[PDB]
């Protein structure tokens, strides 16, 4: 007999997706995609492309979005924590477009005007 329920038991070292293998550090935000008639944010992993939507999985730990917006994702990122347990937290993170600044600025020359 076999059954198929999510009981108060421990867990292995196995994983559940390709993300597992990589870190919050690497994900980051690089652009969205077309979901029918709305918007879905579109994360990288260290070369990994997974794009994700309301209510959906994402990070290293275990991380779920809820909004997405343009430029713009909140989603709750749980991790362990001094409470000895996964906490959730919410966070909202903007497109790391390039938006640098990179303005002018004194430098070692000399000029002639």
């Given at each position: 007999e076999t059954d198929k329920k999510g009981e108060n038991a421990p867990d292995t070292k196995r994983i559940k997706e390709?993300?597992?293998?990589?870190s919050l550090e690497n994900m980051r935000y690089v652009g969205i995609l077309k979901s029918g008639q709305k918007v879905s944010g579109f994360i990288e992993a260290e070369g990994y492309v997974y794009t994700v939507g309301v209510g959906n999985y994402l990070g290293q730990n275990y991380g779920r979005i809820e909004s997405i917006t343009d430029d713009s994702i909140v989603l709750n990122e749980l991790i362990e924590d001094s409470t000895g347990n996964w906490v959730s937290r919410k966070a909202e993170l903007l497109l790391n477009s390039s938006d640098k600044n990179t303005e002018q600025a004194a430098a070692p020359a000399a000029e002639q005007n």
């Open positions: 390709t993300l597992e293998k990589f």
